[PDB]
C-alpha cells in the first residue's frame, strides 16, 4: 500500500524521467526516490506541505549506503493538495536537474557519482498516474 | 539485461494500464508479465516473431505458485521488431482484457482470481518507455 516501485530502469546520463501523479486532498508530504537501490539514492525529492517543521518546502537529499547527506531546500513550492502534479528529472554526471510543474528548475549534485539510475520509488500522498522515460 | 520491473502497482479492477515500449530491432519475441509477483502471473503476454517453434503468434499464459497453465494463442499479430508498440490492459475477477496497437482486443481468463495487480515486468526485448494508469 506504499507506492509504486520500479527497478532495472537503466536511465543513463542525459535521459529525462517524467513523473505525473495526484497529490492527496489532505497531503502532508510525498516522496520520489531515485538511485541505485533503496539505500543508495542520488535523489530524495521530498515536497513537504506540513511535516518535520517544514511548511510548503521542497526538501531534497542524498542517501549513501543508508546515511542521509546534507539537505537542500528550494524557494518555490508549486504543489497543491488534491491536484495533478508532474515533475521532470534529468540525470547528469555532475548534477540531477529537476523541473517542477510551473517550469521552475533546480539542480541537486550527484553526490554518489552514479553513472545510471536503476531505482525509482514513490511514497506518501502522491498517487502516480504515469511515468515516462526518454 | 532484463527489462523494467514494477511492484506495488496496485492496479484495481476497471482501471486501464497502458504500457508503451520499444521492441528490440533483432527480437525473436518479447514478454510483458503481470500478476502478484514473479511466481504468480495473471498474464504472461508473449508475442513471438520466431521463437520456441512459433511464428508471429501471441502466446498468453498464467503462472500460479510457479506452475504454467494452459497457453492460449491469439488470432492477430500487430507487432514488428524494431518499433514502438503500446498495449492496454484492464481486468475484472473473471477475465483480463488486452487491447493491441491495431485496436483489436481479446480476453484471457483471470486464473489467479486476482482482485489487484501489483507486479509487472518486461524482458530484454521490450524496452518500456511509458506506463499509465487511467
Ligand atoms: O533528509 C531526508 C530525511 O529527512 C527527515 O526529516 C525525514 O523524516 C526523512 O523521511 C527524510 O525525508
Ligand atoms: O506457456 C508459458 C511457457 O511457454 C514455454 O514455451 C516457455 O518455454 C516457458 O518458459 C513459458 O514461457
Curated annotation (Swiss-Prot), chains A, B:
Its main location: secreted. Lectin that binds beta-galactoside and a wide array of complex carbohydrates. Plays a role in regulating apoptosis, cell proliferation and cell differentiation. Inhibits CD45 protein phosphatase activity and therefore the dephosphorylation of Lyn kinase. Strong inducer of T-cell apoptosis. Plays a negative role in Th17 cell differentiation via activation of the receptor CD69. A beta-D-galactoside binds at residues 44-48, 52, 61, 68-71. This is Galectin-1. Signal peptide: none annotated. Expressed in placenta, maternal decidua and fetal membranes. Within placenta, expressed in trophoblasts, stromal cells, villous endothelium, syncytiotrophoblast apical membrane and villous stroma. Within fetal membranes, expressed in amnion, chorioamniotic mesenchyma and chorion (at protein level). Expressed in cardiac, smooth, and skeletal muscle, neurons, thymus, kidney and hematopoietic cells. The gene is LGALS1. Keywords: Acetylation, Apoptosis, Cytoplasm, Extracellular matrix, Lectin, Phosphoprotein, Secreted. GO terms for cellular component: collagen-containing extracellular matrix; cytoplasm; cytosol; endoplasmic reticulum lumen; extracellular exosome; extracellular region; extracellular space; galectin complex. It comes from Homo sapiens. The modification N6-acetyllysine is found at residues 12, 28, 107, 127. InterPro entries: ConA-like_dom_sf (IPR013320), Galectin-like (IPR044156), Galectin_CRD (IPR001079).
Amino acid at each position: 500500500a506504499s507506492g509504486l516501485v520500479a527497478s532495472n530502469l537503466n536511465l543513463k546520463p542525459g535521459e529525462c524521467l517524467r513523473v505525473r501523479g495526484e497529490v492527496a486532498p489532505d497531503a502532508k508530504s510525498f516522496v520520489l526516490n531515485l538511485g541505485k537501490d533503496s539505500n543508495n539514492l542520488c535523489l530524495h525529492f521530498n515536497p513537504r506541505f506540513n511535516a518535520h517543521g517544514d511548511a510548503n518546502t521542497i526538501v531534497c537529499n542524498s542517501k549513501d549506503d543508508g546515511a542521509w547527506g546534507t539537505e537542500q531546500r528550494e524557494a518555490v513550492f508549486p504543489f497543491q493538495p488534491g491536484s495533478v502534479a508532474e515533475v521532470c528529472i534529468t540525470f547528469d554526471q555532475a548534477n540531477l536537474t529537476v523541473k517542477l510543474p510551473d517550469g521552475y528548475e533546480f539542480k541537486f549534485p550527484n553526490r554518489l557519482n552514479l553513472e545510471a539510475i536503476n531505482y525509482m520509488a514513490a511514497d506518501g500522498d502522491f498517487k502516480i498516474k504515469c511515468v515516462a522515460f526518454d
